[PDB]
Amino acid sequence: GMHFSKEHINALETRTRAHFINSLSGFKSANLIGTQDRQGNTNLSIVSSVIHLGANPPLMGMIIRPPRHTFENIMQTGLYTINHVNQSIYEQAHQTSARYDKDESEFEATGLTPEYLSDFCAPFVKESRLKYSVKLVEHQHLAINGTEFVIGEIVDVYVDDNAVQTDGFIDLQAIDTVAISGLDCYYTGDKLARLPYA
Amino acid sequence: GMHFSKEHINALETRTRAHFINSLSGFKSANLIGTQDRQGNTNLSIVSSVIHLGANPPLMGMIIRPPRHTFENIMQTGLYTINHVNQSIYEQAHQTSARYDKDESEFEATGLTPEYLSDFCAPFVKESRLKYSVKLVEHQHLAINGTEFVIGEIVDVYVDDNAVQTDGFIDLQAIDTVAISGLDCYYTGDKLARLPYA
Ligand SMILES: [Ca+2]
Ligand SMILES: [Ca+2]
Ligand SMILES: [Ca+2]
Ligand SMILES: [Ca+2]
């Protein structure tokens, strides 16, 4: 067993320490966040920080890193979409994180395709098999490191046919959702089992 | 494609809605949180909400659901361990979530084994292959649904030999870390690829 002390971790070069600490949370979700400004200019960003907050009411949280437009659009319009990345699109999803021209939509820049549904004024990713609209409820600034904790209410959900079981469970491996580890590693899930209420 | 509206989701029975909304974040990390009270009584809980907050300083966040002892111990002593669940121990990890006697340690109650390291006064899970000590920095109460957002600084990390690559990356599949989806589904990761800075 190897031991990395607090001092040893601080000694590491910035990028090495980044890969290392970002690996420590365990698996993370891979989601595309669809937004637009008030003039209808769209944006799309991959994030790995979507976190469940509750089912009643249905609340989802995410942490925004210390592009600017995704957070700015959310703050200005209060609307966004969350779209599962899947194995067919994880390369294009990853590409959204590149730095683009100020007015360059990551939808336009990549092979991903926007989609508007149910009068919701933020674009969905057409290629995503599980996605939902979200309305901003609260944002909390974390001064400890400059992150933003964005809290929103789930509105509408769209999911491939046959994916949602009668008890509400969705098999993420069956719809080919991908997971992330570290800053840049993508994985599919291989189901072990569902375990009953302990 | 199926569409579940806000109204449809609210119509679902509590447990069905729970499975459904908890599936929507995508994959989640599976971590055991080791704690003890001021008298040395230990506790252990599985959580699926550990989230990366930053690498400099190294901060990890977690959301505690709306057992009491894990949060109480953290608040009273300011110390806890975060331990990756792996394929060999996910059944026992799941069992920690059962309701136990007031003074019954989940270490004692399950096949998992406590371990103290480097003078840190919170127990580690011996069987975990990636684990770290954490010191409480901040806790924020979320009144929107009664959750607690617990923020701590990573102190010491312990990891199986050969797991940490020279660039800091840790292959979670190689150390057999497990992921969670929904409320009760466990998975291993099957690596697709690491992608370069876009
Ligand atoms: Ca050593
Ligand atoms: Ca496109
Ligand atoms: Ca329909
Ligand atoms: Ca035991």
PDB file of N, CA and C in Angstrom, chain A residues 1-6 16-17 19-20 22-25 27 29 31 49 51-53 55 84 94 132 138 144-145 151 155-159 161 167-168 170 172 177 184 186-190 192-196, chain B residues 1-6 16-17 19-20 22-25 27 29 31 49 51-53 55 84 94 132 138 144-145 151 155-159 161 167-168 170 172 177 184 186-190 192-196:
ATOM      1  N   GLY A   1       0.858  -1.214   0.000  1.00  0.00           N
ATOM      2  CA  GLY A   1       0.000   0.000   0.000  1.00  0.00           C
ATOM      3  C   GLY A   1       0.871   1.233   0.000  1.00  0.00           C
ATOM      4  N   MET A   2       0.508   2.208  -0.824  1.00  0.00           N
ATOM      5  CA  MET A   2       1.297   3.386  -0.876  1.00  0.00           C
ATOM      6  C   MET A   2       0.560   4.479  -0.107  1.00  0.00           C
ATOM      7  N   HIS A   3       1.337   5.381   0.483  1.00  0.00           N
ATOM      8  CA  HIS A   3       0.800   6.456   1.244  1.00  0.00           C
ATOM      9  C   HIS A   3       1.281   7.785   0.697  1.00  0.00           C
ATOM     10  N   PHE A   4       0.322   8.623   0.294  1.00  0.00           N
ATOM     11  CA  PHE A   4       0.563   9.975  -0.162  1.00  0.00           C
ATOM     12  C   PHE A   4       0.057  10.944   0.910  1.00  0.00           C
ATOM     13  N   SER A   5       0.987  11.635   1.519  1.00  0.00           N
ATOM     14  CA  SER A   5       0.677  12.530   2.562  1.00  0.00           C
ATOM     15  C   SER A   5       0.220  13.832   1.981  1.00  0.00           C
ATOM     16  N   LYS A   6      -0.365  14.641   2.854  1.00  0.00           N
ATOM     17  CA  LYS A   6      -0.787  15.991   2.519  1.00  0.00           C
ATOM     18  C   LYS A   6       0.350  16.795   1.862  1.00  0.00           C
ATOM     19  N   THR A  16      -0.438  16.971 -12.568  1.00  0.00           N
ATOM     20  CA  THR A  16      -0.389  15.664 -11.860  1.00  0.00           C
ATOM     21  C   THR A  16      -1.291  15.651 -10.641  1.00  0.00           C
ATOM     22  N   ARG A  17      -1.203  16.703  -9.822  1.00  0.00           N
ATOM     23  CA  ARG A  17      -2.081  16.801  -8.656  1.00  0.00           C
ATOM     24  C   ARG A  17      -3.557  16.824  -9.107  1.00  0.00           C
ATOM     25  N   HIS A  19      -4.949  15.454 -11.931  1.00  0.00           N
ATOM     26  CA  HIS A  19      -5.379  14.113 -12.278  1.00  0.00           C
ATOM     27  C   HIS A  19      -5.609  13.227 -11.057  1.00  0.00           C
ATOM     28  N   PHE A  20      -4.682  13.360 -10.102  1.00  0.00           N
ATOM     29  CA  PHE A  20      -4.696  12.554  -8.860  1.00  0.00           C
ATOM     30  C   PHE A  20      -5.915  12.874  -7.986  1.00  0.00           C
ATOM     31  N   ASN A  22      -8.635  14.535  -8.742  1.00  0.00           N
ATOM     32  CA  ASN A  22      -9.886  14.321  -9.480  1.00  0.00           C
ATOM     33  C   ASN A  22     -10.227  12.837  -9.586  1.00  0.00           C
ATOM     34  N   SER A  23      -9.247  11.942  -9.440  1.00  0.00           N
ATOM     35  CA  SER A  23      -9.514  10.505  -9.403  1.00  0.00           C
ATOM     36  C   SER A  23     -10.111  10.004  -8.078  1.00  0.00           C
ATOM     37  N   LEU A  24      -9.924  10.764  -7.005  1.00  0.00           N
ATOM     38  CA  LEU A  24     -10.254  10.274  -5.689  1.00  0.00           C
ATOM     39  C   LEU A  24     -11.755  10.161  -5.394  1.00  0.00           C
ATOM     40  N   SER A  25     -12.633  10.887  -6.086  1.00  0.00           N
ATOM     41  CA  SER A  25     -14.086  10.808  -5.755  1.00  0.00           C
ATOM     42  C   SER A  25     -14.678   9.462  -6.112  1.00  0.00           C
ATOM     43  N   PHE A  27     -16.165   7.016  -9.408  1.00  0.00           N
ATOM     44  CA  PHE A  27     -16.834   7.289 -10.691  1.00  0.00           C
ATOM     45  C   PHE A  27     -17.734   8.532 -10.586  1.00  0.00           C
ATOM     46  N   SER A  29     -20.626  11.018 -13.050  1.00  0.00           N
ATOM     47  CA  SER A  29     -21.552  11.002 -14.165  1.00  0.00           C
ATOM     48  C   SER A  29     -21.034  11.865 -15.307  1.00  0.00           C
ATOM     49  N   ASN A  31     -22.479  14.121 -18.225  1.00  0.00           N
ATOM     50  CA  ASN A  31     -23.664  14.820 -18.695  1.00  0.00           C
ATOM     51  C   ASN A  31     -23.321  16.036 -19.532  1.00  0.00           C
ATOM     52  N   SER A  49     -20.110  16.826 -12.675  1.00  0.00           N
ATOM     53  CA  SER A  49     -20.510  17.141 -11.296  1.00  0.00           C
ATOM     54  C   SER A  49     -21.995  17.138 -10.977  1.00  0.00           C
ATOM     55  N   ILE A  51     -25.205  16.051  -9.400  1.00  0.00           N
ATOM     56  CA  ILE A  51     -25.453  15.303  -8.192  1.00  0.00           C
ATOM     57  C   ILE A  51     -26.927  15.333  -7.830  1.00  0.00           C
ATOM     58  N   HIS A  52     -27.440  14.192  -7.409  1.00  0.00           N
ATOM     59  CA  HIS A  52     -28.800  14.102  -6.985  1.00  0.00           C
ATOM     60  C   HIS A  52     -29.028  14.872  -5.688  1.00  0.00           C
ATOM     61  N   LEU A  53     -30.076  15.676  -5.578  1.00  0.00           N
ATOM     62  CA  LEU A  53     -30.352  16.379  -4.293  1.00  0.00           C
ATOM     63  C   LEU A  53     -31.629  15.889  -3.663  1.00  0.00           C
ATOM     64  N   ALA A  55     -35.789  13.722  -4.579  1.00  0.00           N
ATOM     65  CA  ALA A  55     -36.827  13.221  -5.473  1.00  0.00           C
ATOM     66  C   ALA A  55     -38.173  13.929  -5.285  1.00  0.00           C
ATOM     67  N   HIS A  84     -27.657  12.748 -20.701  1.00  0.00           N
ATOM     68  CA  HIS A  84     -26.664  11.734 -20.522  1.00  0.00           C
ATOM     69  C   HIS A  84     -25.798  11.560 -21.730  1.00  0.00           C
ATOM     70  N   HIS A  94     -16.749  15.129 -25.201  1.00  0.00           N
ATOM     71  CA  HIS A  94     -15.462  15.597 -24.735  1.00  0.00           C
ATOM     72  C   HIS A  94     -14.992  16.834 -25.502  1.00  0.00           C
ATOM     73  N   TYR A 132     -33.331  15.755 -19.638  1.00  0.00           N
ATOM     74  CA  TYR A 132     -34.402  16.465 -18.920  1.00  0.00           C
ATOM     75  C   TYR A 132     -34.159  17.925 -18.839  1.00  0.00           C
ATOM     76  N   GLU A 138     -31.820  27.944  -7.133  1.00  0.00           N
ATOM     77  CA  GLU A 138     -30.884  28.579  -6.238  1.00  0.00           C
ATOM     78  C   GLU A 138     -29.478  28.450  -6.778  1.00  0.00           C
ATOM     79  N   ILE A 144     -14.652  29.255  -0.766  1.00  0.00           N
ATOM     80  CA  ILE A 144     -13.503  28.400  -0.432  1.00  0.00           C
ATOM     81  C   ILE A 144     -12.637  28.103  -1.658  1.00  0.00           C
ATOM     82  N   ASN A 145     -13.241  27.966  -2.828  1.00  0.00           N
ATOM     83  CA  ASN A 145     -12.445  27.781  -4.039  1.00  0.00           C
ATOM     84  C   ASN A 145     -13.056  28.368  -5.308  1.00  0.00           C
ATOM     85  N   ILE A 151     -28.402  24.752  -8.231  1.00  0.00           N
ATOM     86  CA  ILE A 151     -29.509  23.882  -7.824  1.00  0.00           C
ATOM     87  C   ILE A 151     -30.701  24.165  -8.686  1.00  0.00           C
ATOM     88  N   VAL A 155     -37.955  19.456 -14.632  1.00  0.00           N
ATOM     89  CA  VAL A 155     -39.280  19.724 -15.208  1.00  0.00           C
ATOM     90  C   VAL A 155     -39.768  18.449 -15.950  1.00  0.00           C
ATOM     91  N   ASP A 156     -39.338  18.298 -17.211  1.00  0.00           N
ATOM     92  CA  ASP A 156     -39.713  17.218 -18.083  1.00  0.00           C
ATOM     93  C   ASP A 156     -38.539  16.237 -18.309  1.00  0.00           C
ATOM     94  N   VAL A 157     -38.816  14.928 -18.387  1.00  0.00           N
ATOM     95  CA  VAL A 157     -37.796  13.889 -18.710  1.00  0.00           C
ATOM     96  C   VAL A 157     -38.159  13.168 -20.004  1.00  0.00           C
ATOM     97  N   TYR A 158     -37.137  12.879 -20.809  1.00  0.00           N
ATOM     98  CA  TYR A 158     -37.261  12.212 -22.103  1.00  0.00           C
ATOM     99  C   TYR A 158     -36.310  11.069 -22.083  1.00  0.00           C
ATOM    100  N   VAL A 159     -36.795   9.889 -22.421  1.00  0.00           N
ATOM    101  CA  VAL A 159     -35.991   8.707 -22.290  1.00  0.00           C
ATOM    102  C   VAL A 159     -36.366   7.688 -23.363  1.00  0.00           C
ATOM    103  N   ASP A 161     -37.553   4.526 -25.267  1.00  0.00           N
ATOM    104  CA  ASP A 161     -38.627   3.612 -24.961  1.00  0.00           C
ATOM    105  C   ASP A 161     -38.051   2.366 -24.331  1.00  0.00           C
ATOM    106  N   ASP A 167     -40.829  -0.317 -11.648  1.00  0.00           N
ATOM    107  CA  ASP A 167     -40.510   0.240 -10.337  1.00  0.00           C
ATOM    108  C   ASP A 167     -39.776   1.564 -10.417  1.00  0.00           C
ATOM    109  N   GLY A 168     -39.576   2.125 -11.616  1.00  0.00           N
ATOM    110  CA  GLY A 168     -38.936   3.419 -11.800  1.00  0.00           C
ATOM    111  C   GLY A 168     -37.460   3.334 -12.104  1.00  0.00           C
ATOM    112  N   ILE A 170     -33.959   2.755 -13.951  1.00  0.00           N
ATOM    113  CA  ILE A 170     -33.444   2.844 -15.327  1.00  0.00           C
ATOM    114  C   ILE A 170     -32.076   2.198 -15.400  1.00  0.00           C
ATOM    115  N   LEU A 172     -28.755   1.935 -16.575  1.00  0.00           N
ATOM    116  CA  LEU A 172     -27.862   2.864 -17.286  1.00  0.00           C
ATOM    117  C   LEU A 172     -26.977   2.152 -18.287  1.00  0.00           C
ATOM    118  N   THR A 177     -25.225   4.667 -21.105  1.00  0.00           N
ATOM    119  CA  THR A 177     -24.704   5.872 -20.391  1.00  0.00           C
ATOM    120  C   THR A 177     -23.226   5.584 -20.060  1.00  0.00           C
ATOM    121  N   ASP A 184     -10.433  13.002 -17.442  1.00  0.00           N
ATOM    122  CA  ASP A 184     -10.481  12.647 -18.877  1.00  0.00           C
ATOM    123  C   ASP A 184     -10.705  11.191 -19.269  1.00  0.00           C
ATOM    124  N   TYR A 186     -13.164   7.904 -19.758  1.00  0.00           N
ATOM    125  CA  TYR A 186     -14.557   7.522 -19.994  1.00  0.00           C
ATOM    126  C   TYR A 186     -14.723   6.005 -19.885  1.00  0.00           C
ATOM    127  N   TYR A 187     -15.850   5.572 -19.338  1.00  0.00           N
ATOM    128  CA  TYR A 187     -16.145   4.172 -19.130  1.00  0.00           C
ATOM    129  C   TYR A 187     -17.583   3.836 -19.385  1.00  0.00           C
ATOM    130  N   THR A 188     -17.868   2.572 -19.743  1.00  0.00           N
ATOM    131  CA  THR A 188     -19.261   2.082 -19.677  1.00  0.00           C
ATOM    132  C   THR A 188     -19.405   1.336 -18.344  1.00  0.00           C
ATOM    133  N   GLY A 189     -20.643   1.054 -17.931  1.00  0.00           N
ATOM    134  CA  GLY A 189     -20.899   0.364 -16.679  1.00  0.00           C
ATOM    135  C   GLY A 189     -21.200  -1.080 -17.009  1.00  0.00           C
ATOM    136  N   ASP A 190     -20.744  -1.995 -16.141  1.00  0.00           N
ATOM    137  CA  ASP A 190     -21.033  -3.411 -16.253  1.00  0.00           C
ATOM    138  C   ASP A 190     -21.738  -3.786 -14.954  1.00  0.00           C
ATOM    139  N   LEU A 192     -23.443  -5.307 -11.809  1.00  0.00           N
ATOM    140  CA  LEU A 192     -23.141  -6.379 -10.891  1.00  0.00           C
ATOM    141  C   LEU A 192     -24.463  -6.914 -10.388  1.00  0.00           C
ATOM    142  N   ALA A 193     -25.220  -6.068  -9.688  1.00  0.00           N
ATOM    143  CA  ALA A 193     -26.547  -6.435  -9.158  1.00  0.00           C
ATOM    144  C   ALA A 193     -27.261  -5.239  -8.560  1.00  0.00           C
ATOM    145  N   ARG A 194     -28.597  -5.359  -8.444  1.00  0.00           N
ATOM    146  CA  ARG A 194     -29.397  -4.471  -7.604  1.00  0.00           C
ATOM    147  C   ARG A 194     -29.581  -5.197  -6.300  1.00  0.00           C
ATOM    148  N   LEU A 195     -29.399  -4.509  -5.179  1.00  0.00           N
ATOM    149  CA  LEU A 195     -29.508  -5.102  -3.861  1.00  0.00           C
ATOM    150  C   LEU A 195     -30.718  -4.543  -3.187  1.00  0.00           C
ATOM    151  N   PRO A 196     -31.411  -5.350  -2.396  1.00  0.00           N
ATOM    152  CA  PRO A 196     -32.653  -4.884  -1.757  1.00  0.00           C
ATOM    153  C   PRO A 196     -32.412  -3.943  -0.611  1.00  0.00           C
TER     154      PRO A 196
ATOM    155  N   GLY B   1     -39.382   7.420 -28.233  1.00  0.00           N
ATOM    156  CA  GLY B   1     -38.946   8.175 -27.030  1.00  0.00           C
ATOM    157  C   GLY B   1     -40.134   8.416 -26.129  1.00  0.00           C
ATOM    158  N   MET B   2     -39.937   8.214 -24.832  1.00  0.00           N
ATOM    159  CA  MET B   2     -41.020   8.413 -23.939  1.00  0.00           C
ATOM    160  C   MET B   2     -40.803   9.745 -23.225  1.00  0.00           C
ATOM    161  N   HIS B   3     -41.911  10.386 -22.871  1.00  0.00           N
ATOM    162  CA  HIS B   3     -41.875  11.644 -22.206  1.00  0.00           C
ATOM    163  C   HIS B   3     -42.625  11.570 -20.892  1.00  0.00           C
ATOM    164  N   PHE B   4     -41.906  11.855 -19.802  1.00  0.00           N
ATOM    165  CA  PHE B   4     -42.456  11.942 -18.467  1.00  0.00           C
ATOM    166  C   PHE B   4     -42.473  13.415 -18.046  1.00  0.00           C
ATOM    167  N   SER B   5     -43.664  13.941 -17.910  1.00  0.00           N
ATOM    168  CA  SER B   5     -43.837  15.299 -17.577  1.00  0.00           C
ATOM    169  C   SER B   5     -43.696  15.469 -16.096  1.00  0.00           C
ATOM    170  N   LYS B   6     -43.554  16.728 -15.705  1.00  0.00           N
ATOM    171  CA  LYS B   6     -43.505  17.118 -14.305  1.00  0.00           C
ATOM    172  C   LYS B   6     -44.690  16.538 -13.512  1.00  0.00           C
ATOM    173  N   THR B  16     -41.342   4.421  -6.382  1.00  0.00           N
ATOM    174  CA  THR B  16     -41.124   4.481  -7.852  1.00  0.00           C
ATOM    175  C   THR B  16     -40.501   5.798  -8.274  1.00  0.00           C
ATOM    176  N   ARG B  17     -41.052   6.907  -7.771  1.00  0.00           N
ATOM    177  CA  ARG B  17     -40.476   8.216  -8.078  1.00  0.00           C
ATOM    178  C   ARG B  17     -39.019   8.283  -7.571  1.00  0.00           C
ATOM    179  N   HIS B  19     -36.782   5.711  -7.158  1.00  0.00           N
ATOM    180  CA  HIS B  19     -35.911   4.994  -8.068  1.00  0.00           C
ATOM    181  C   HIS B  19     -35.654   5.753  -9.367  1.00  0.00           C
ATOM    182  N   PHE B  20     -36.737   6.350  -9.876  1.00  0.00           N
ATOM    183  CA  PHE B  20     -36.710   7.094 -11.156  1.00  0.00           C
ATOM    184  C   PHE B  20     -35.828   8.345 -11.069  1.00  0.00           C
ATOM    185  N   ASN B  22     -33.646   9.195  -8.779  1.00  0.00           N
ATOM    186  CA  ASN B  22     -32.276   8.850  -8.382  1.00  0.00           C
ATOM    187  C   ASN B  22     -31.488   8.255  -9.547  1.00  0.00           C
ATOM    188  N   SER B  23     -32.161   7.719 -10.568  1.00  0.00           N
ATOM    189  CA  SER B  23     -31.485   7.244 -11.774  1.00  0.00           C
ATOM    190  C   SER B  23     -31.020   8.360 -12.723  1.00  0.00           C
ATOM    191  N   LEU B  24     -31.622   9.540 -12.610  1.00  0.00           N
ATOM    192  CA  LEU B  24     -31.409  10.572 -13.594  1.00  0.00           C
ATOM    193  C   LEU B  24     -30.026  11.233 -13.555  1.00  0.00           C
ATOM    194  N   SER B  25     -29.296  11.198 -12.440  1.00  0.00           N
ATOM    195  CA  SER B  25     -27.974  11.890 -12.396  1.00  0.00           C
ATOM    196  C   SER B  25     -26.948  11.211 -13.277  1.00  0.00           C
ATOM    197  N   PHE B  27     -24.210   7.822 -13.548  1.00  0.00           N
ATOM    198  CA  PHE B  27     -23.430   7.031 -12.582  1.00  0.00           C
ATOM    199  C   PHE B  27     -22.983   7.901 -11.395  1.00  0.00           C
ATOM    200  N   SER B  29     -20.574   7.669  -7.553  1.00  0.00           N
ATOM    201  CA  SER B  29     -19.497   6.982  -6.868  1.00  0.00           C
ATOM    202  C   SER B  29     -20.032   6.195  -5.680  1.00  0.00           C
ATOM    203  N   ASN B  31     -18.823   5.040  -2.089  1.00  0.00           N
ATOM    204  CA  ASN B  31     -17.839   5.279  -1.045  1.00  0.00           C
ATOM    205  C   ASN B  31     -18.373   4.951   0.335  1.00  0.00           C
ATOM    206  N   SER B  49     -22.880  10.210  -2.824  1.00  0.00           N
ATOM    207  CA  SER B  49     -22.856  11.648  -3.132  1.00  0.00           C
ATOM    208  C   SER B  49     -21.525  12.369  -3.012  1.00  0.00           C
ATOM    209  N   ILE B  51     -18.485  14.252  -4.102  1.00  0.00           N
ATOM    210  CA  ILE B  51     -18.251  15.062  -5.272  1.00  0.00           C
ATOM    211  C   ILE B  51     -16.948  15.831  -5.145  1.00  0.00           C
ATOM    212  N   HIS B  52     -16.202  15.882  -6.233  1.00  0.00           N
ATOM    213  CA  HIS B  52     -14.981  16.621  -6.260  1.00  0.00           C
ATOM    214  C   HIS B  52     -15.239  18.122  -6.169  1.00  0.00           C
ATOM    215  N   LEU B  53     -14.522  18.862  -5.335  1.00  0.00           N
ATOM    216  CA  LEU B  53     -14.713  20.339  -5.287  1.00  0.00           C
ATOM    217  C   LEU B  53     -13.487  21.068  -5.772  1.00  0.00           C
ATOM    218  N   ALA B  55      -8.773  20.649  -6.436  1.00  0.00           N
ATOM    219  CA  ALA B  55      -7.486  19.988  -6.253  1.00  0.00           C
ATOM    220  C   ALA B  55      -6.476  20.846  -5.483  1.00  0.00           C
ATOM    221  N   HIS B  84     -13.108   3.910  -1.142  1.00  0.00           N
ATOM    222  CA  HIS B  84     -13.764   3.350  -2.284  1.00  0.00           C
ATOM    223  C   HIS B  84     -14.298   1.977  -2.021  1.00  0.00           C
ATOM    224  N   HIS B  94     -23.198  -2.287   1.025  1.00  0.00           N
ATOM    225  CA  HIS B  94     -24.629  -2.082   0.969  1.00  0.00           C
ATOM    226  C   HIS B  94     -25.301  -2.380   2.311  1.00  0.00           C
ATOM    227  N   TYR B 132      -8.906   7.769   1.991  1.00  0.00           N
ATOM    228  CA  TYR B 132      -8.251   9.000   2.461  1.00  0.00           C
ATOM    229  C   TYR B 132      -8.934   9.594   3.635  1.00  0.00           C
ATOM    230  N   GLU B 138     -16.309  23.064   6.289  1.00  0.00           N
ATOM    231  CA  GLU B 138     -17.542  23.812   6.239  1.00  0.00           C
ATOM    232  C   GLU B 138     -18.718  22.869   6.124  1.00  0.00           C
ATOM    233  N   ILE B 144     -33.937  23.898   1.233  1.00  0.00           N
ATOM    234  CA  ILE B 144     -34.815  23.489   0.126  1.00  0.00           C
ATOM    235  C   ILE B 144     -35.309  22.051   0.291  1.00  0.00           C
ATOM    236  N   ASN B 145     -34.486  21.170   0.839  1.00  0.00           N
ATOM    237  CA  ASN B 145     -34.951  19.811   1.106  1.00  0.00           C
ATOM    238  C   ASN B 145     -34.323  19.142   2.325  1.00  0.00           C
ATOM    239  N   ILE B 151     -18.339  19.781   3.429  1.00  0.00           N
ATOM    240  CA  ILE B 151     -17.117  20.111   2.691  1.00  0.00           C
ATOM    241  C   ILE B 151     -15.928  19.844   3.562  1.00  0.00           C
ATOM    242  N   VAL B 155      -6.623  14.989   3.662  1.00  0.00           N
ATOM    243  CA  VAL B 155      -5.358  15.003   4.410  1.00  0.00           C
ATOM    244  C   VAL B 155      -4.380  13.991   3.754  1.00  0.00           C
ATOM    245  N   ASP B 156      -4.504  12.712   4.141  1.00  0.00           N
ATOM    246  CA  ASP B 156      -3.666  11.633   3.694  1.00  0.00           C
ATOM    247  C   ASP B 156      -4.426  10.683   2.738  1.00  0.00           C
ATOM    248  N   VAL B 157      -3.758  10.165   1.699  1.00  0.00           N
ATOM    249  CA  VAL B 157      -4.337   9.153   0.769  1.00  0.00           C
ATOM    250  C   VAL B 157      -3.541   7.854   0.829  1.00  0.00           C
ATOM    251  N   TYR B 158      -4.262   6.734   0.771  1.00  0.00           N
ATOM    252  CA  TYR B 158      -3.706   5.385   0.833  1.00  0.00           C
ATOM    253  C   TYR B 158      -4.253   4.647  -0.337  1.00  0.00           C
ATOM    254  N   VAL B 159      -3.381   4.020  -1.103  1.00  0.00           N
ATOM    255  CA  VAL B 159      -3.800   3.407  -2.332  1.00  0.00           C
ATOM    256  C   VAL B 159      -2.944   2.180  -2.632  1.00  0.00           C
ATOM    257  N   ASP B 161      -0.527  -0.394  -4.235  1.00  0.00           N
ATOM    258  CA  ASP B 161       0.697  -0.180  -4.968  1.00  0.00           C
ATOM    259  C   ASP B 161       0.419  -0.320  -6.446  1.00  0.00           C
ATOM    260  N   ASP B 167       1.486  10.345 -14.249  1.00  0.00           N
ATOM    261  CA  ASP B 167       0.776  11.605 -14.449  1.00  0.00           C
ATOM    262  C   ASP B 167      -0.295  11.856 -13.406  1.00  0.00           C
ATOM    263  N   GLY B 168      -0.430  10.992 -12.393  1.00  0.00           N
ATOM    264  CA  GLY B 168      -1.385  11.169 -11.309  1.00  0.00           C
ATOM    265  C   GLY B 168      -2.684  10.427 -11.511  1.00  0.00           C
ATOM    266  N   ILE B 170      -5.443   7.542 -11.782  1.00  0.00           N
ATOM    267  CA  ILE B 170      -5.697   6.237 -11.148  1.00  0.00           C
ATOM    268  C   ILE B 170      -6.768   5.498 -11.923  1.00  0.00           C
ATOM    269  N   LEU B 172      -9.578   3.376 -12.206  1.00  0.00           N
ATOM    270  CA  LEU B 172     -10.562   2.873 -11.234  1.00  0.00           C
ATOM    271  C   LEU B 172     -10.990   1.452 -11.537  1.00  0.00           C
ATOM    272  N   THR B 177     -12.867  -0.475  -8.360  1.00  0.00           N
ATOM    273  CA  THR B 177     -13.850   0.475  -7.757  1.00  0.00           C
ATOM    274  C   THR B 177     -15.207   0.196  -8.434  1.00  0.00           C
ATOM    275  N   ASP B 184     -29.895   1.619  -5.647  1.00  0.00           N
ATOM    276  CA  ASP B 184     -29.479   0.253  -5.265  1.00  0.00           C
ATOM    277  C   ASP B 184     -28.757  -0.612  -6.292  1.00  0.00           C
ATOM    278  N   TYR B 186     -25.374  -1.634  -8.437  1.00  0.00           N
ATOM    279  CA  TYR B 186     -23.912  -1.573  -8.396  1.00  0.00           C
ATOM    280  C   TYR B 186     -23.319  -2.050  -9.724  1.00  0.00           C
ATOM    281  N   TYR B 187     -22.235  -1.415 -10.148  1.00  0.00           N
ATOM    282  CA  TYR B 187     -21.575  -1.719 -11.397  1.00  0.00           C
ATOM    283  C   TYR B 187     -20.082  -1.642 -11.301  1.00  0.00           C
ATOM    284  N   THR B 188     -19.367  -2.381 -12.167  1.00  0.00           N
ATOM    285  CA  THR B 188     -17.928  -2.104 -12.363  1.00  0.00           C
ATOM    286  C   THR B 188     -17.814  -1.217 -13.610  1.00  0.00           C
ATOM    287  N   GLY B 189     -16.647  -0.602 -13.820  1.00  0.00           N
ATOM    288  CA  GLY B 189     -16.431   0.271 -14.960  1.00  0.00           C
ATOM    289  C   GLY B 189     -15.652  -0.513 -15.991  1.00  0.00           C
ATOM    290  N   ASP B 190     -15.963  -0.276 -17.275  1.00  0.00           N
ATOM    291  CA  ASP B 190     -15.244  -0.864 -18.388  1.00  0.00           C
ATOM    292  C   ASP B 190     -14.711   0.313 -19.196  1.00  0.00           C
ATOM    293  N   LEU B 192     -13.238   2.915 -21.680  1.00  0.00           N
ATOM    294  CA  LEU B 192     -13.366   3.176 -23.094  1.00  0.00           C
ATOM    295  C   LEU B 192     -12.061   3.790 -23.548  1.00  0.00           C
ATOM    296  N   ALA B 193     -11.738   4.967 -23.012  1.00  0.00           N
ATOM    297  CA  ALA B 193     -10.484   5.675 -23.334  1.00  0.00           C
ATOM    298  C   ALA B 193     -10.288   6.894 -22.456  1.00  0.00           C
ATOM    299  N   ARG B 194      -9.024   7.349 -22.367  1.00  0.00           N
ATOM    300  CA  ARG B 194      -8.698   8.676 -21.852  1.00  0.00           C
ATOM    301  C   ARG B 194      -8.548   9.559 -23.061  1.00  0.00           C
ATOM    302  N   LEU B 195      -9.133  10.750 -23.033  1.00  0.00           N
ATOM    303  CA  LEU B 195      -9.096  11.676 -24.148  1.00  0.00           C
ATOM    304  C   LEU B 195      -8.257  12.850 -23.761  1.00  0.00           C
ATOM    305  N   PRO B 196      -7.511  13.411 -24.704  1.00  0.00           N
ATOM    306  CA  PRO B 196      -6.609  14.527 -24.375  1.00  0.00           C
ATOM    307  C   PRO B 196      -7.330  15.825 -24.152  1.00  0.00           C
TER     308      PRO B 196
END
